[PDB]
Amino acid sequence: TSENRAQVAARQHNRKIVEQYMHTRGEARLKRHLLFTEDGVGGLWTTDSGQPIAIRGREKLGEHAVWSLQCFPDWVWTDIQIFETQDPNWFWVECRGEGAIVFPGYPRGQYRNHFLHSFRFENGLIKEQREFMNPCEQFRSLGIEVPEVRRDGLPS
């Protein structure tokens, strides 16, 4: 059907955008915001406070990349697995990430973590990117003590 053709076409184009995003590194990160719609949103959905840190708007995304290039100067996404879905405009990615972390007021460290990303598209560009990770590993990379759930009472 004409609908299936349109959905197939959208999914193939959108997959190329996800691939490009995931392989953007170095100075090219300063232009990654051009993969978003003008009102596109990106950011980190898993933080210590329980609220997302959402960067709203293509312009603010480009401004944020200037910061992230300083505080994550050599970040790489690795082990990238891209998942298309029944929605041609919705993709998920499982990957790892790694790089130096140079966060204001903390010792320089090395950060490694597992990540899941969600990518939702509109008219050929990213409308919403969300990443999900375990913040405990970011705490460790910053030298912040991670609390330990006591396991004495739990099954082996």
| Residues at the contact surface with ligand A1IAL, assessed by CB under 6 A | 43-44, 47-48, 53, 67-68, 135, 138, 149, 151, 154-155
What is the length of the chain? 156
Of 29, 92, 100, 120, the one binding a copy of itself (CB under 8 A) is 92
Please say which residue, 5 or 153, places its beta carbon nearer to a copy of itself.
Answer: 153
Q: Tokens 């298309």, residue?
A: 84
Please say which residue, 7 or 118, places its beta carbon nearer to a copy of itself.
Answer: 118
Partner that binds at residue 44, options ligand A1IAL, a copy of itself, none, CB closer than 5 to 8 Å by kind: ligand A1IAL
